[PDB]
Amino acid sequence: HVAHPSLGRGDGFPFLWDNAASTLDQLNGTDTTIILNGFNYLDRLSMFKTVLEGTRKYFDSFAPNNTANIYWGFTIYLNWILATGRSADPTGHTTCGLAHGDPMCLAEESWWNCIKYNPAAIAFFAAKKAGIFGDVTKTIVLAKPKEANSPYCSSEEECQAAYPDVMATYLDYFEYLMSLEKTGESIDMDKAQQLLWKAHVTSMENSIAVCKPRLKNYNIIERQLDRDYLISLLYFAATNFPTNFIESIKFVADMPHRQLRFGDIAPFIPDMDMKKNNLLVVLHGFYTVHSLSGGSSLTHWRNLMESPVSREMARDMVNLILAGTPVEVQVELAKLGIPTPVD
Ligand SMILES: *[C@@H]1O[C@H](CO)[C@@H](O)[C@H](O)[C@H]1NC(C)=O
């Protein structure tokens, strides 16, 4: 049994989905503690699954099996980083995440692990604080990293102190959900999605500098994919594109199913379909507009995306992209009136 990059266990749900905890009471611990290893795939999956379960009631009517829940995004991406080897140690110094080592271990040295840790762990703490899990008197005890002055926080208090804006933005999301029963209002899906994206973006922006050195652990082609993806995510987030089950699977199905290497040039990678080859070009297209504009294009894009009509039009573009339609990022952005750069 191994994780499939886009199908997870087989039907889109993550590898080992059934094995992960639905509630805090199913986790290991003591009378006064709950134990979680943030460097273990199953415990990270439990950080997502417990929040999915605890927020199911807000999304239940919209679709079966909690599939309308917008928390699926980073849950599905956890499966993908495992399945494609991107959570393993890339340095060769340890066997963490390798088949001949502990395949569930998530390496400190992994760039993907580095950027994705907080959207699991800090978000989990924020959900706890907001009351998503009910009243919890037990202390969360996280496994500590080995590296001194690590980018990985290992307690509720340390995470708050090191990444205050990330804690605050995820808290805003969960507090909004918690407010709905007092009012008796049904969820405003566009608002909920905006709040969650704001937290994800804040996390990415708070991690980019501290995770940057890990990019040097990968060859230049894989390294550039990593950069391309993080910048592109900032543009996608501003469109308010949905992060529910079906849309998340649609995205990961277009991502490369293996690490890239020297020799790979999109859109001519012969062991990948046209949709994967096309998304690789598009991600680099966003990187290029961003780099050549000194980052100014993102500021203009965000201003434009203050309009709900603009956001809907931009989501239409994203859907074309996900279907494998070969659109030129630079050309499409200009159409939307973004001042675009020359070299
Ligand atoms: C939920 O998903 C499971 C697994 O894919 C499926 O067998 C089942 O039909 C779905 N449940 C409902 C109520 O639609």
Side-chain angles (χ1 to χ4, degrees), residues 2-343:
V2 73
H4 191 280
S6 54
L7 295 166
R9 72 188 184 177
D11 63 351
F13 287 82
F15 186 61
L16 311 175
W17 177 250
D18 265 334
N19 301 246
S22 292
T23 59
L24 269 49
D25 284 327
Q26 300 178 310
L27 296 168
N28 292 329
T30 68
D31 260 7
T32 57
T33 67
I34 292 160
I35 295 161
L36 283 165
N37 180 0
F39 304 97
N40 173 271
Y41 169 81
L42 194 58
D43 286 6
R44 284 269 285 284
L45 185 58
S46 296
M47 297 178 185
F48 290 112
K49 184 168 180 190
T50 56
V51 173
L52 279 163
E53 189 60 48
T55 59
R56 177 175 185 148
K57 61 174 167 180
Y58 310 110
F59 302 94
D60 192 63
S61 59
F62 298 131
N65 269 325
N66 203 21
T67 57
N69 201 310
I70 58 164
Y71 215 70
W72 279 109
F74 281 63
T75 311
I76 297 305
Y77 268 88
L78 185 72
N79 176 88
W80 178 83
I81 68 173
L82 176 74
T84 64
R86 290 179 165 97
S87 55
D89 183 358
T91 66
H93 296 159
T94 74
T95 63
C96 172
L98 303 179
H100 60 276
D102 177 5
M104 295 287 99
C105 177
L106 316 171
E108 287 174 50
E109 303 88 346
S110 160
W111 182 86
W112 286 92
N113 193 36
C114 190
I115 63 154
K116 297 310 187 190
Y117 183 90
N118 286 349
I122 295 188
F124 178 88
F125 284 126
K128 180 177 166 282
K129 286 177 192 293
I132 294 292
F133 306 131
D135 34 43
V136 184
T137 55
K138 296 180 188 193
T139 301
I140 309 308
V141 176
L142 292 181
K144 282 178 156 36
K146 292 158 180 160
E147 187 192 1
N149 298 286
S150 173
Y152 306 98
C153 59
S154 65
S155 78
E156 195 167 331
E157 293 79 14
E158 185 197 351
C159 293
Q160 158 67 46
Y163 300 97
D165 292 349
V166 186
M167 185 72 76
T169 50
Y170 281 110
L171 187 63
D172 285 335
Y173 173 66
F174 295 116
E175 287 186 332
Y176 168 64
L177 298 181
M178 289 296 290
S179 82
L180 298 173
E181 288 190 358
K182 311 195 213 305
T183 62
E185 297 161 329
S186 48
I187 192 166
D188 173 344
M189 287 296 285
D190 196 66
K191 179 175 175 175
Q193 186 71 77
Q194 194 178 76
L195 287 168
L196 187 57
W197 267 127
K198 179 169 177 199
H200 292 334
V201 164
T202 302
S203 193
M204 293 305 111
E205 290 178 334
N206 273 250
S207 292
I208 184 164
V210 76
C211 297
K212 181 169 193 218
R214 290 158 171 81
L215 289 171
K216 282 149 139 52
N217 295 337
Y218 302 88
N219 70 76
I220 193 148
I221 309 304
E222 174 69 11
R223 187 186 306 159
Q224 191 58 46
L225 165 66
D226 293 354
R227 296 188 186 111
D228 291 346
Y229 165 84
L230 192 149
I231 296 305
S232 291
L233 185 62
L234 307 177
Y235 289 81
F236 293 137
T239 74
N240 218 34
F241 199 84
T243 53
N244 63 25
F245 183 83
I246 293 300
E247 306 287 358
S248 295
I249 292 177
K250 218 160 78 189
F251 251 103
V252 300
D254 290 1
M255 287 289 285
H257 65 283
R258 58 168 176 84
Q259 290 170 67
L260 303 191
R261 59 179 171 263
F262 180 72
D264 290 331
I265 307 289
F268 312 119
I269 301 163
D271 64 334
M272 292 183 194
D273 65 21
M274 282 189 277
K275 288 171 167 179
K276 291 180 189 161
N277 271 291
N278 182 62
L279 183 59
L280 291 169
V281 170
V282 167
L283 303 177
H284 193 58
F286 281 109
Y287 182 87
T288 299
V289 174
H290 194 83
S291 164
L292 293 182
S293 78
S296 307
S297 55
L298 180 53
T299 299
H300 294 307
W301 182 246
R302 286 166 169 176
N303 289 337
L304 185 76
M305 293 298 113
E306 288 171 2
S307 164
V309 176
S310 289
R311 297 200 294 271
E312 186 167 22
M313 291 183 289
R315 294 192 292 274
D316 296 335
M317 179 195 68
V318 176
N319 277 317
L320 282 182
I321 289 165
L322 291 175
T325 309
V327 287
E328 291 191 53
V329 163
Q330 293 77 10
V331 173
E332 295 307 305
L333 263 37
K335 264 155 139 202
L336 290 151
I338 297 320
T340 49
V342 300
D343 202 331

Coordinates of all heavy atoms in Angstrom, one line a residue, residues 147-204:
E147 N 16.8 20.5 15.1 CA 17.6 21.7 14.8 C 17.4 22.8 15.8 O 16.3 23.0 16.3 CB 17.2 22.2 13.4 CG 18.0 23.3 12.9 CD 17.4 24.0 11.7 OE1 16.3 23.7 11.2 OE2 18.1 25.0 11.1
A148 N 18.5 23.4 16.2 CA 18.4 24.6 17.1 C 17.9 25.8 16.3 O 18.2 25.9 15.1 CB 19.8 24.9 17.6
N149 N 17.1 26.6 16.9 CA 16.4 27.7 16.3 C 15.7 27.3 15.0 O 15.9 27.8 13.9 CB 17.4 28.9 15.9 CG 18.0 29.5 17.2 OD1 17.4 30.2 17.9 ND2 19.3 29.1 17.4
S150 N 14.8 26.3 15.2 CA 14.1 25.6 14.1 C 12.9 26.5 13.6 O 12.4 27.2 14.4 CB 13.5 24.3 14.6 OG 12.7 23.7 13.7
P151 N 12.6 26.4 12.3 CA 11.4 27.1 11.9 C 10.1 26.4 12.4 O 9.0 27.0 12.3 CB 11.5 27.0 10.3 CG 12.3 25.8 10.1 CD 13.3 25.7 11.2
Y152 N 10.2 25.2 12.9 CA 9.1 24.4 13.4 C 8.8 24.7 14.9 O 9.7 24.3 15.8 CB 9.3 22.9 13.2 CG 9.7 22.5 11.8 CD1 11.0 22.3 11.3 CD2 8.6 22.3 10.8 CE1 11.3 22.0 10.0 CE2 8.9 22.0 9.5 CZ 10.2 21.8 9.1 OH 10.5 21.4 7.8
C153 N 7.7 25.3 15.2 CA 7.3 25.5 16.6 C 6.7 24.2 17.2 O 6.1 23.4 16.5 CB 6.3 26.7 16.7 SG 4.7 26.5 15.8
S154 N 6.8 24.1 18.5 CA 6.5 22.9 19.2 C 5.6 23.1 20.5 O 5.6 22.2 21.3 CB 7.7 22.1 19.6 OG 8.6 22.7 20.5
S155 N 4.9 24.2 20.6 CA 3.9 24.4 21.6 C 3.0 25.5 21.2 O 3.3 26.3 20.4 CB 4.5 24.6 23.0 OG 4.9 26.0 23.1
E156 N 1.8 25.5 21.9 CA 0.8 26.5 21.6 C 1.4 27.9 21.8 O 1.2 28.8 21.0 CB -0.4 26.3 22.5 CG -1.7 27.0 22.1 CD -2.9 26.5 22.8 OE1 -3.1 25.3 23.1 OE2 -3.8 27.4 22.9
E157 N 2.1 28.1 22.9 CA 2.7 29.4 23.3 C 3.8 29.8 22.3 O 3.9 30.9 22.0 CB 3.2 29.4 24.7 CG 2.1 29.3 25.8 CD 1.5 27.8 26.0 OE1 2.2 26.8 25.5 OE2 0.5 27.7 26.6
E158 N 4.7 28.8 22.0 CA 5.8 29.1 21.1 C 5.3 29.5 19.7 O 5.9 30.4 19.0 CB 6.8 27.9 21.0 CG 8.0 28.2 20.1 CD 8.8 27.0 19.7 OE1 8.5 25.9 20.1 OE2 9.7 27.2 18.8
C159 N 4.3 28.8 19.2 CA 3.8 29.0 17.9 C 3.2 30.5 17.8 O 3.4 31.2 16.9 CB 2.7 28.0 17.5 SG 3.3 26.3 17.2
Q160 N 2.4 30.8 18.9 CA 1.8 32.1 19.0 C 2.9 33.2 19.0 O 2.8 34.2 18.3 CB 1.1 32.2 20.3 CG 0.9 33.6 20.8 CD 0.0 34.4 19.9 OE1 -1.1 34.0 19.5 NE2 0.4 35.7 19.7
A161 N 4.0 33.0 19.7 CA 5.1 34.0 19.8 C 5.9 34.1 18.5 O 6.2 35.2 18.2 CB 6.0 33.6 21.0
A162 N 6.2 33.0 17.9 CA 7.0 33.1 16.6 C 6.2 33.5 15.4 O 6.7 34.1 14.5 CB 7.6 31.7 16.4
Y163 N 4.9 33.1 15.4 CA 4.0 33.4 14.2 C 2.7 34.0 14.6 O 1.6 33.5 14.3 CB 3.8 32.1 13.4 CG 5.1 31.5 12.9 CD1 5.6 30.4 13.6 CD2 5.6 31.9 11.7 CE1 6.8 29.8 13.1 CE2 6.8 31.3 11.2 CZ 7.4 30.2 11.9 OH 8.5 29.6 11.4
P164 N 2.7 35.2 15.3 CA 1.5 35.8 15.8 C 0.4 36.1 14.8 O -0.8 35.9 15.0 CB 2.0 37.1 16.5 CG 3.3 37.4 15.8 CD 3.9 36.0 15.5
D165 N 0.8 36.5 13.6 CA -0.1 36.9 12.5 C -0.8 35.6 11.9 O -1.9 35.7 11.4 CB 0.5 37.7 11.4 CG 1.0 39.0 11.8 OD1 0.6 39.5 12.9 OD2 1.7 39.7 11.1
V166 N -0.1 34.5 11.9 CA -0.6 33.2 11.4 C -1.6 32.7 12.4 O -2.7 32.3 12.0 CB 0.5 32.2 11.2 CG1 -0.1 31.0 10.5 CG2 1.6 32.8 10.3
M167 N -1.3 32.7 13.7 CA -2.3 32.3 14.7 C -3.5 33.2 14.6 O -4.6 32.7 14.6 CB -1.7 32.4 16.1 CG -2.6 31.9 17.2 SD -2.8 30.1 17.2 CE -1.3 29.5 17.9
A168 N -3.3 34.5 14.5 CA -4.4 35.4 14.5 C -5.4 35.2 13.3 O -6.6 35.3 13.5 CB -3.9 36.9 14.5
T169 N -4.8 35.0 12.1 CA -5.6 34.8 10.9 C -6.4 33.5 10.9 O -7.6 33.5 10.5 CB -4.8 35.1 9.6 OG1 -3.6 34.3 9.7 CG2 -4.5 36.5 9.5
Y170 N -5.8 32.4 11.3 CA -6.6 31.2 11.4 C -7.6 31.3 12.5 O -8.8 30.8 12.4 CB -5.7 30.0 11.7 CG -5.0 29.4 10.5 CD1 -3.6 29.6 10.3 CD2 -5.7 28.8 9.4 CE1 -3.0 29.1 9.2 CE2 -5.1 28.4 8.3 CZ -3.7 28.5 8.2 OH -3.1 28.1 7.0
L171 N -7.3 32.0 13.6 CA -8.3 32.2 14.7 C -9.5 33.0 14.2 O -10.6 32.6 14.5 CB -7.6 32.9 15.9 CG -8.5 33.1 17.1 CD1 -8.9 31.7 17.7 CD2 -7.7 33.9 18.2
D172 N -9.3 34.0 13.4 CA -10.4 34.8 12.7 C -11.3 33.9 11.9 O -12.5 34.0 12.0 CB -9.8 35.8 11.8 CG -9.2 37.1 12.5 OD1 -9.6 37.4 13.6 OD2 -8.4 37.7 11.8
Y173 N -10.8 32.9 11.2 CA -11.6 32.0 10.4 C -12.5 31.1 11.4 O -13.7 31.0 11.2 CB -10.7 31.1 9.6 CG -11.5 29.9 8.9 CD1 -12.4 30.2 7.9 CD2 -11.3 28.6 9.3 CE1 -13.1 29.2 7.3 CE2 -12.0 27.6 8.7 CZ -12.9 27.9 7.7 OH -13.6 26.9 7.1
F174 N -11.8 30.5 12.3 CA -12.6 29.6 13.2 C -13.6 30.3 14.1 O -14.6 29.8 14.4 CB -11.6 28.7 14.1 CG -10.8 27.8 13.3 CD1 -9.4 27.9 13.2 CD2 -11.4 26.8 12.5 CE1 -8.7 27.0 12.4 CE2 -10.7 25.9 11.7 CZ -9.3 26.0 11.6
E175 N -13.2 31.6 14.5 CA -14.1 32.4 15.3 C -15.3 32.8 14.5 O -16.5 32.9 15.0 CB -13.4 33.6 15.9 CG -12.5 33.3 17.0 CD -11.9 34.5 17.7 OE1 -11.7 35.5 17.0 OE2 -11.5 34.4 18.9
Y176 N -15.2 33.0 13.2 CA -16.3 33.3 12.3 C -17.2 32.1 12.3 O -18.4 32.3 12.5 CB -15.8 33.7 10.9 CG -17.0 33.7 9.9 CD1 -18.0 34.6 10.1 CD2 -17.1 32.8 8.9 CE1 -19.1 34.6 9.2 CE2 -18.2 32.8 8.0 CZ -19.2 33.7 8.2 OH -20.3 33.7 7.3
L177 N -16.7 30.9 12.1 CA -17.6 29.7 12.1 C -18.3 29.6 13.4 O -19.5 29.3 13.5 CB -16.8 28.4 11.8 CG -16.1 28.3 10.5 CD1 -15.3 27.0 10.4 CD2 -17.0 28.5 9.3
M178 N -17.6 29.8 14.5 CA -18.2 29.7 15.9 C -19.3 30.7 16.1 O -20.2 30.5 16.9 CB -17.1 29.8 17.0 CG -16.2 28.5 17.1 SD -17.0 27.0 17.6 CE -17.4 27.4 19.3
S179 N -19.2 31.8 15.4 CA -20.3 32.9 15.5 C -21.6 32.5 14.9 O -22.6 33.2 15.2 CB -19.7 34.2 14.9 OG -19.8 34.2 13.5
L180 N -21.6 31.6 14.0 CA -22.9 31.3 13.2 C -24.0 30.8 14.0 O -25.2 31.1 13.7 CB -22.6 30.3 12.1 CG -21.5 30.9 11.0 CD1 -21.2 29.8 10.1 CD2 -22.1 32.1 10.3
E181 N -23.8 29.9 15.0 CA -24.8 29.4 15.9 C -25.5 30.5 16.8 O -26.7 30.4 17.0 CB -24.3 28.2 16.7 CG -24.1 27.0 15.8 CD -23.9 25.7 16.6 OE1 -23.8 25.8 17.8 OE2 -23.8 24.7 15.9
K182 N -24.7 31.4 17.2 CA -25.2 32.5 18.0 C -26.2 33.3 17.2 O -27.2 33.7 17.8 CB -24.1 33.5 18.5 CG -22.9 32.8 19.1 CD -22.1 33.8 19.9 CE -20.6 33.6 19.9 NZ -20.2 32.2 20.4
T183 N -25.9 33.6 16.0 CA -26.7 34.4 15.1 C -27.8 33.6 14.5 O -28.9 34.1 14.2 CB -25.9 35.0 13.9 OG1 -25.3 34.0 13.1 CG2 -24.7 35.9 14.4
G184 N -27.6 32.3 14.4 CA -28.5 31.4 13.6 C -28.4 31.6 12.1 O -29.2 31.1 11.4
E185 N -27.4 32.4 11.7 CA -27.2 32.6 10.2 C -26.5 31.4 9.6 O -25.8 30.7 10.3 CB -26.2 33.7 10.0 CG -26.6 35.1 10.5 CD -25.4 36.0 10.6 OE1 -24.2 35.5 10.9 OE2 -25.5 37.2 10.4
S186 N -26.8 31.1 8.3 CA -26.0 30.1 7.6 C -24.7 30.7 7.2 O -24.6 32.0 7.0 CB -26.8 29.6 6.4 OG -27.3 30.7 5.7
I187 N -23.7 29.9 6.9 CA -22.4 30.3 6.5 C -22.5 31.2 5.2 O -23.3 30.9 4.3 CB -21.5 29.1 6.3 CG1 -20.0 29.6 6.1 CG2 -21.9 28.2 5.2 CD1 -19.1 28.4 6.3
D188 N -21.7 32.2 5.1 CA -21.4 33.0 3.9 C -20.1 32.3 3.3 O -19.0 32.6 3.8 CB -21.3 34.5 4.2 CG -20.8 35.3 3.0 OD1 -20.4 34.8 2.0 OD2 -21.0 36.6 3.2
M189 N -20.3 31.5 2.3 CA -19.2 30.7 1.8 C -18.1 31.6 1.2 O -16.9 31.3 1.4 CB -19.8 29.7 0.7 CG -20.5 28.5 1.3 SD -19.5 27.4 2.3 CE -18.6 26.6 1.1
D190 N -18.4 32.7 0.5 CA -17.4 33.5 -0.1 C -16.6 34.2 1.1 O -15.3 34.2 1.0 CB -18.0 34.6 -1.0 CG -17.0 35.3 -1.9 OD1 -16.5 34.6 -2.7 OD2 -16.8 36.5 -1.7
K191 N -17.2 34.6 2.1 CA -16.5 35.2 3.3 C -15.7 34.2 4.0 O -14.5 34.5 4.4 CB -17.6 35.8 4.3 CG -17.0 36.4 5.5 CD -18.0 37.1 6.4 CE -17.4 37.6 7.7 NZ -18.4 38.3 8.5
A192 N -16.2 33.0 4.2 CA -15.4 31.9 4.9 C -14.2 31.6 4.1 O -13.1 31.4 4.6 CB -16.3 30.7 5.0
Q193 N -14.4 31.4 2.7 CA -13.2 31.1 1.9 C -12.2 32.3 1.9 O -11.0 32.0 1.9 CB -13.7 30.8 0.5 CG -12.7 30.4 -0.5 CD -12.2 29.0 -0.2 OE1 -12.9 28.0 -0.5 NE2 -11.0 28.9 0.4
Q194 N -12.6 33.5 1.9 CA -11.7 34.7 2.0 C -10.9 34.6 3.3 O -9.7 34.9 3.3 CB -12.5 36.0 1.9 CG -11.7 37.2 1.7 CD -12.5 38.4 1.5 OE1 -12.9 39.0 2.5 NE2 -12.6 38.9 0.3
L195 N -11.6 34.4 4.4 CA -10.9 34.3 5.7 C -9.9 33.2 5.7 O -8.8 33.4 6.2 CB -11.9 34.1 6.9 CG -12.7 35.4 7.2 CD1 -13.9 35.1 8.1 CD2 -11.8 36.5 7.8
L196 N -10.2 32.0 5.2 CA -9.3 30.9 5.2 C -8.1 31.2 4.3 O -7.0 30.9 4.7 CB -10.0 29.6 4.8 CG -9.2 28.3 5.0 CD1 -8.6 28.1 6.4 CD2 -9.9 27.1 4.5
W197 N -8.4 31.7 3.1 CA -7.3 32.0 2.2 C -6.3 33.1 2.8 O -5.1 33.0 2.6 CB -7.7 32.5 0.9 CG -7.9 31.5 -0.3 CD1 -9.0 31.3 -1.0 CD2 -6.9 30.6 -0.7 NE1 -8.7 30.3 -1.9 CE2 -7.5 29.9 -1.8 CE3 -5.6 30.3 -0.4 CZ2 -6.8 28.9 -2.5 CZ3 -4.9 29.3 -1.0 CH2 -5.5 28.6 -2.1
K198 N -6.9 34.0 3.5 CA -6.1 35.1 4.2 C -5.1 34.4 5.2 O -3.9 34.8 5.2 CB -7.0 36.1 4.9 CG -6.2 37.2 5.6 CD -7.1 38.3 6.0 CE -6.4 39.4 6.8 NZ -7.3 40.2 7.6
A199 N -5.6 33.4 5.9 CA -4.7 32.7 6.8 C -3.7 31.9 6.1 O -2.5 31.9 6.5 CB -5.6 31.8 7.7
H200 N -4.1 31.2 5.0 CA -3.1 30.4 4.3 C -2.0 31.3 3.7 O -0.8 31.0 3.7 CB -3.7 29.6 3.1 CG -4.7 28.5 3.5 ND1 -4.6 27.8 4.7 CD2 -5.7 27.9 2.8 CE1 -5.5 26.9 4.7 NE2 -6.2 26.9 3.6
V201 N -2.4 32.4 3.1 CA -1.5 33.4 2.5 C -0.5 34.0 3.6 O 0.7 34.1 3.3 CB -2.2 34.5 1.8 CG1 -1.3 35.7 1.5 CG2 -2.9 34.0 0.5
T202 N -1.1 34.4 4.7 CA -0.3 34.9 5.8 C 0.8 33.9 6.2 O 1.9 34.2 6.5 CB -1.2 35.3 7.0 OG1 -2.1 36.3 6.6 CG2 -0.3 35.9 8.2
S203 N 0.4 32.6 6.3 CA 1.3 31.5 6.6 C 2.4 31.4 5.6 O 3.6 31.4 5.9 CB 0.6 30.2 6.8 OG 1.4 29.2 7.4
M204 N 2.0 31.4 4.3 CA 3.0 31.3 3.2 C 4.0 32.5 3.3 O 5.3 32.2 3.2 CB 2.4 31.3 1.8 CG 1.6 30.0 1.5 SD 2.4 28.5 1.7 CE 1.6 27.8 3.1

